Amino acid sequence: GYDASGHVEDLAAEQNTQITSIAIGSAEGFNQADKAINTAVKSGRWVMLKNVHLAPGWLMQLEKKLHSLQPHACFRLFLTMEINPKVPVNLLRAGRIFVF
Amino acid sequence: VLNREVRRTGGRVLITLGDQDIDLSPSFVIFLSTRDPTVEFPPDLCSRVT
Amino acid sequence: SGGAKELKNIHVCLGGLFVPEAYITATRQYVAQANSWSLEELCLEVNVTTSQGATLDACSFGVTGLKLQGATCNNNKLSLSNAISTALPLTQLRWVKQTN
Amino acid sequence: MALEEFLKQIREVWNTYELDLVNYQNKCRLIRGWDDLFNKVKEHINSVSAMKLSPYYKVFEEDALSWEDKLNRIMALFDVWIDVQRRWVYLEGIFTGSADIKHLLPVETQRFQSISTEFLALMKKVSKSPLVMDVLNIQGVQRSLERLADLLGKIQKALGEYLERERSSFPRFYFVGDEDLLEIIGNSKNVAKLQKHFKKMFAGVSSIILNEDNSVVLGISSREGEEVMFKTPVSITEHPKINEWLTLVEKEMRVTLAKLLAESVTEVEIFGKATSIDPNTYITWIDKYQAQLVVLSAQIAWSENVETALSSMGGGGDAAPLHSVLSNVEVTLNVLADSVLMEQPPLRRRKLEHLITELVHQRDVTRSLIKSKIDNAKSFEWLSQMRFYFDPKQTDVLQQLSIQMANAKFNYGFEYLGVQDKLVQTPLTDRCYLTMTQALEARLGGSPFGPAGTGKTESVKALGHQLGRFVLVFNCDETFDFQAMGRIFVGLCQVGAWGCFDEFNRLEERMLSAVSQQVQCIQEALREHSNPNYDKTSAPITCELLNKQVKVSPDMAIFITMNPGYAGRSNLPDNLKKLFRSLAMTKPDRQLIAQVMLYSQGFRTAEVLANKIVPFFKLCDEQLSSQSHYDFGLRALKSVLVSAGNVKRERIQKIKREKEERGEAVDEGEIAENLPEQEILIQSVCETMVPKLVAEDIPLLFSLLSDVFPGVQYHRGEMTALREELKKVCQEMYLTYGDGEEVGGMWVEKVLQLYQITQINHGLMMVGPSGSGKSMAWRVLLKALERLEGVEGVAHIIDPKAISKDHLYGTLDPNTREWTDGLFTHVLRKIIDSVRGELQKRQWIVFDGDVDPEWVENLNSVLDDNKLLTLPNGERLSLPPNVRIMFEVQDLKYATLATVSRCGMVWFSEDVLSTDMIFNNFLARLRSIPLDESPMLQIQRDAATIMQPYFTSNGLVTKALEHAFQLEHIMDLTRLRCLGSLFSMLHQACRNVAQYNANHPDFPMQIEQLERYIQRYLVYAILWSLSGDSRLKMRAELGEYIRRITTVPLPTAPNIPIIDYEVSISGEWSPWQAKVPQIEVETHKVAAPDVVVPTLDTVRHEALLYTWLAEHKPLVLCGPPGSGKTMTLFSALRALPDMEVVGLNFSSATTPELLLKTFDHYCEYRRTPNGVVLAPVQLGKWLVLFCDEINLPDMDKYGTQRVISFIRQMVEHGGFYRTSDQTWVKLERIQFVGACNPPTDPGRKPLSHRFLRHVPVVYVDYPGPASLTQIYGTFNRAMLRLIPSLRTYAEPLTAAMVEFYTMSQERFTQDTQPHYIYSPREMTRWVRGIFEALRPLETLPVEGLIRIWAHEALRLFQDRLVEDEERRWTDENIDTVALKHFPNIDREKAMSRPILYSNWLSKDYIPVDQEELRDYVKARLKVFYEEELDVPLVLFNEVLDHVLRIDRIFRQPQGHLLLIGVSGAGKTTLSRFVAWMNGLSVYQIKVHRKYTGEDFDEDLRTVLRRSGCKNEKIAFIMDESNVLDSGFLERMNTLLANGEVPGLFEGDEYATLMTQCKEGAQKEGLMLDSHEELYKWFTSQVIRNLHVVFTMNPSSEGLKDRAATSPALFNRCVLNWFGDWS
Amino acid sequence: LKRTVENIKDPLFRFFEREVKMGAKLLQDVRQDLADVVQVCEGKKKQTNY
């Protein structure tokens, strides 16, 4: 019943920073997420990926991709998800968790 | 490779990687690593590693 | 032992019944058929007795096991209560002609 | 002589009959008149077939046969020709009227150019000789048309991207299929063919109105017949291109509706604010304008009347003219009611009904306003109402009307709606309108949610239609993915139409999340439309959909109706839910809808009728018993009310018809006054609810009717003519027909009930337990309707759970987005297209199988009022009125409320089909149908005469069956399984009498001998059909009961059961023991896989199997594993020549694909004039599919096994559906035998009763101690003739074996470990192992034989044990049994505990010392390190024992190993070492991360080529970790069990395999050329050469699941529990 | 409950008949199941899948 995607959108609006928001369910969603992350890490652009709990296997590879990366200091990746046991532990440790 | 299944024939030490045989050099060593302390390994992999 | 006419006199714990809605509707249909009325022309009146085993009218049925949550009933008189559940000894459900 | 007349008439017909030609655009001469040609061919074929029945056909046989051939050839060629022609036509129109496609698709254009060149040359050849015979005699014309059809189809599938680009031009094409779009584009000139497609592209435009030239579109028409004339016509000549003038037609439709509304309003304004309304002027006004326009004008007029009244009351205390608005509405409603009381034209009647509904709403709203003292037009209780403001001064006609609800404002879309049912405007409906309009004003989607049948979909459609919006309903499922939803959104955005997605939560959660962003971007485009800053004279509003900039029309909306209460539905993610405004719709106002509908239909007592009918539905829901097929919801009440209207109209028509023949005083008012409205309602209620009720509920519902409707009686109309037609059909199908309480009367009543259900519902179910006469009921009804009405009836029977859902409904290609039709989709599309006149026939689509929500909910929009099948490609298929959707089910315990409420119900009880009816059917077929293909018929008639007394009511068979139901059986007991087995056995008895007459041509069997034979055989058959599936004690119980109740003479033996006797052909009871001789087995086939020791059970089971098999009746053998089921079946088949057995081994993952692969290998499909026939390749041979584990394959969550449903379909319907082209295939010379363990065993599921009714089951238990002693005693006596000095030890040794085996079978069971199964198979292996260790021995002391016996026992029993105490117990009890049966021996020389045998230190397999074996193994490992694997091994005693065991298994044909132990124990290394000791090449699959099923298939092909073609002995060593998928195990199971994989070698691989097997068999000295013989030799070589070694870790749950996943691994592989190092 | 021509007309009897019928069916099923469980726990009948 709660979703923090609107919080991220309002935050980006206040900071006057551009953000690309992608739903994760589709395979084209995976491709767009990869391209958006690759573009944003070199420009400080913000990426938000919603409902990532629906793709845990892709989430593990996303964690592995994020580990070996030196993005722009202004780059921010937001992962919106439900509180779900299927979310990988490695991703949880890699990122900072906020409970809504 | 982890089982050290080497075939010594004709003065050659061969390791069968996939479908291809390779001359194994004695100085080879391999280290497997992970960053997840909670990952579960199958018993077959546990038997081949330290 | 006595015929179907003894079904009207017996007190019924509504919780024990598998489908209490059908019991309520059956009592309403019984009263409507006794007076040749319709189901929609009958309104239900509730009487709470101090003790079980009282005089049952031809249009009245005895119900046991009803638990009043949040209230107390004295002389068929409700008052707000700080208790969780209060046992209702015997509830007489009476189907009477609706005077709207 | 008349037969020669028929032949002469046919000859004269086809000597002058010319196919009729018509000039096509000066381009060619096409063929027309297809219906006449096909009808002529069909009726000549029917005449030719019918004259064969005449006894005078022989003299005219040849010629007639010739004509049949010719006719069939004709029926071939033209059945292709038309499709070709049709396709070519539109394809030509595409490759000639558009020059852009030539540059766009050059290769396709040139291909079609060549195709058209050949097509036109064929056209010219037909033109020169239009005679049909000469056309048929054109050289190779059949192949020419087939090739043309294939090529045209390929061009069709090539034109897809052109179809998409054309859809871009006219967005409504987005909701039209590729076939239909091509037909539209290619037939732009011939506009008539376009008509059938308009209902796809428009809400209410069913056809367009065309001038005489067909060049000017004058107007449009609806399905009912309502017509709209364009104010200015659209000229096709001025705008030839089809999308242009279609756009002009749509725009002119909208503008014409706007202008007609502008005139309708200014005329209706007179009717409003008027004291009295003249009926003539009012009815003329309603007739002049369209129903949509009439209702809209009434709503407007009421709106400005209320606005004027409220503006007048602005003073607060002023007088109220709202009462005057009330009075005007009252007067108009009075006129409307007076009109509907009398007979009216149907279109005008429906207009009046809609007016009544709307003005009832207006009356309620005005009453509410007056009750609340409303005097200000700005008060919310008026603003909350839906108001209609019309401004004629507006320059744009499309903007003169505005519809306002609260703050939401809308423009009327002016989409033509035709004449549509309009909902009763209930308070729930008002709340729905308010909430959805608030959502629309916020540019949010609407989301009504609640239980099924509350009005969600209807309410959304009614809201859209009230706004003049094109509303499209989609029945969503999991196939509606991101791309399909995106394409649908693109179509609706460009069109500007409303999208209503029902069951939207049936999508996957990931797909819902993905679709959320498309919804969000579309909602943003709608918001830029709302932005005032935005000007209409600017860049069009556009959003990004599917990576394309798509224009968004402001009139579109997105709605989702769903049921959150259903379990298994996908939860909607929050970001998706915030895009929608949700409304709970749970409790519809039933009373108000009932009252309004009855008042609009003309019922004068509508209030009382509704107040009686709604509580009656409540009392039926609650008072009646609970059944899964019971529904008393809103759909049921709606159906009853509509039926009440229909019955009232037909009753008025009947009354006036009677008045015509009795005087002429026909006053409609008098008819309305004296009309039994309650009787009409009772008739509708009965005709709709009675068929669904169980027997005990019928008096309950009649009592409820008497309570609610006192004094009203319901009487069915005596439908005579239908009953005589059904009686004739029953006579010609050997069925029992009864009337009332006679035999069959209940079934006939159910037939009539199904009949009147078919007249009220387009979707209906017949629900009843297996064997209730349901199939016969609907088939006989179809035939009777065909005879009575003259309309041909065609039934398409689908088993929806015998195939995948993708194969049932279709598949959208993930990459090319190409749609492939499913079976049901293909059939319905074929009916709709009506190429061969399907629309003129009765079409019954019967789903004969299990119903589950996964597949049946795709029919939610089909079974409801929509009558639309929605596909994920945006295509919608309308259900034609001649099509009925039927479901034939035994239960509905998994169906949900929506499906139940969306389909009429006929309930069939077990009492409907009585046992006497079945007996009558069987005896009628016996007396009429000869079994041979008449003396055989005479024998059958005499046998029926003899058996008739026992087949009566309360006779021998009925009492026997009633007693047998109380007995325990290994499977669930059903009546029809026993009856079918009994009837097959009696048919076998008749064949036995015929064959006896064949043996005695001089003295055929007399009537007395026949009677004595038949009575005893009837007793015998009853016994084996009612207790053959039960254990021995039950058989004795049934036999003694029969003895008590029968009058048939019986054996007089005191303590021998009747089941121990056969019936000799001389009509005498002869003991089965007379056919069980004490055989002496030849010493070289001791315990051979083919040798069978005769036993009472063996002789009885073989006879019963012979009886069932020779009739080709499918059967199942059930028993404990190793009970001898396969052995008995092969023994019986040995007595049946011309029968080839093929073994399939079922696993939990077994699908019909295994059977399909087996048919591909062993059978062929062939075209015949009656369809596709699948027959075995070898001619004259019947093929038996032996399924060894038929009850293992996985049962889904809805209680269905797909392979069981498929086998049931083949057995009952005689075929199946080939899903490549959705064609029916009929089996020929193929029967089914299954084997299984009891369903109570782990992993075993109970078989479906619908499957069991066709399949006799025979129970085969383990042989008892005496039988085991006899069978293996003969084996021992045969084997110990090798050493004469040991002969006297035959009896003790056998005894010892038996005792130990029995003790083992008691000590270790499946409860402890899943692999603790001991059967006579261990005894056979024991005998074989001792025999192999005895052949090369000239002599042996008794202690040596005892040592061999103990060693074999240790190998067979101890090697599989897990725990140390179990092995200790086995070791101790070996000694115990050995010294019990063999005293006076030296214990030490026979039971020295290190019992090791080997052939490594000697030529023979002799005992070997542990130290010498250790030295030898060290010496061999020294060489092994330097030759194969340089991994030094520490050598301990368990290793020596393990390598001895592995060597033993490697020295056996089909020697497979299951090594279970901890990883790193050396299982693989020891296996490789032993394989190297035996000359076996080690094969291991090289698994990597990208290793797939295809890689495993290639590896299997490689290893099988090496093992079966090159005669190479290969140890295929594989671990559980190598199993990356369950298909690996499915292949491995078949390879282990049979040494062959049916589908592994296909295409070029099979040809290469055949070449290699030929060159390998020629090297072996064998003369083999046939592919079948070569494949058999290859299988035998694989069997003898390949040794599979399975290695896996010990896991209790893993092992238990492993047993079900790969059963062969636990019964074809020797299991060795190496475990952990001790 | 015993069905009677005049008992069918009584709604109370109809509801109570449904009640007693379903209750008796459930009672028989539960008692048979528990008896089978008891017989299993005494080692007298074999454990089926159900």
Ligand SMILES: Nc1ncnc2c1ncn2[C@@H]1O[C@H](COP(=O)(O)OP(=O)(O)OP(=O)(O)O)[C@@H](O)[C@H]1O
């Ligand atoms: N009126 C009749 N009189 C006598 N025998 C009949 C009659 N109708 C059907 N039968 C016979 O009784 C059996 C009924 O089979 P039918 O297919 O009608 O049953 P069903 O309930 O549809 O079966 P299932 O549940 O397996 O689909 C058949 O053997 C049929 O020949």
Ligand SMILES: Nc1ncnc2c1ncn2[C@@H]1O[C@H](COP(=O)(O)OP(=O)(O)O)[C@@H](O)[C@H]1O
């Ligand atoms: N206001 C109404 N007036 C008349 N019939 C209605 C009304 N609302 C719903 N119905 C009827 O209720 C039945 C179910 O409607 P439907 O929209 O399919 O419900 P749901 O979406 O909840 O399953 C249909 O027969 C429909 O015509």
Ligand SMILES: Nc1ncnc2c1ncn2[C@@H]1O[C@H](COP(=O)(O)OP(=O)(O)O)[C@@H](O)[C@H]1O
């Ligand atoms: N009369 C018999 N003659 C020979 N072997 C028999 C006889 N009865 C039982 N057997 C043995 O019983 C076992 C049956 O094995 P199988 O046919 O695979 O059983 P099932 O089909 O029940 O799985 C074999 O070991 C077979 O030799």
Ligand SMILES: Nc1ncnc2c1ncn2[C@@H]1O[C@H](COP(=O)(O)OP(=O)(O)O)[C@@H](O)[C@H]1O
């Ligand atoms: N008898 C043995 N002597 C020495 N090493 C052994 C022995 N048995 C197992 N191993 C160890 O186990 C490893 C793997 O052997 P393998 O046959 O693959 O075992 P498993 O079949 O149990 O997986 C060897 O390389 C060796 O290190």
Ligand SMILES: [Mg+2]
């Ligand atoms: Mg709906």
Ligand SMILES: [Mg+2]
């Ligand atoms: Mg049937």
